[PDB]
Design a protein around this ligand. Sequence first.
Ligand code: MG
Ligand code: MG
Lengths: 8, 292
Amino acid sequence: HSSGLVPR
Amino acid sequence: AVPGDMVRIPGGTFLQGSPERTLDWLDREGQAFPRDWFTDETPQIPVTLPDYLIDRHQVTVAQFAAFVSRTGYVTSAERAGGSMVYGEQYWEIREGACWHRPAGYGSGIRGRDDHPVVHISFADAEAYARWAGRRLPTESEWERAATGPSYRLWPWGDTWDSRNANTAEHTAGALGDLDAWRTWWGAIHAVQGPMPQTTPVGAFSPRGDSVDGCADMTGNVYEWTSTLAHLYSPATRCDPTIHLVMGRSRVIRGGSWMNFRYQVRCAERLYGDPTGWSNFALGFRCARDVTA
Ligand SMILES: [Mg+2]
Ligand SMILES: [Mg+2]
């Protein structure tokens, strides 16, 4: 899992 | 000895972040996100920096290629077999997507080697910077180079102008209204045609440059910094999804071609997973101590 870009 | 591709930022103390009146302004604009999406820019804090150097331009495709050619470096995305592209509604993994296949298998970088390189992970960016004899900017060095020695919304000042950078404001304005822009968004993802809508580095110079000479600090691609996500005060309160990445993500700055004016401000903060993740709109530039 990856938090990616935050905030989304 | 300032390298020709860098600019010297004069040392000084500056107010990092956004004043409350800017967040009040955002609350009253016609834009979607709640105030606690912007409180991570608050409160403003005094930040003292020496003279330092920062790249004029984002690292380009040509420049990254020469690094790969000379070292054999394999990027996170290539090791993982895929990377993120923005589809019709959400970010999605696209097999084969990487710096030289920006939209996945079936795409290439033909004739865009002066565009910013994308699908760069945090480690890719640090590997390149290290090979170049440089490093990533810190978040403070990035913002100071964007806003200049006094507070401004965008590098050129406080008045928006869609001609000054590569953002969705230009596209939406060109199509006449946001509804037509929304229709266009749908069509171009059915056409499946193009993907990353980057522009050559320095295309909007001088009008969109910062006071010290940096180009594309607004829009085009997101940029990694070396700074670990942190709040400017222990009492600042933001959306819980923001708190969740504090002390874990690295800060990403400058917004992208996909953003409108409010998410490309000098002080806008964004956060990225530094463990290998990347996307088709995320690049970087380098910085360096004056003597290193
Ligand atoms: Mg940007
Ligand atoms: Mg933000």
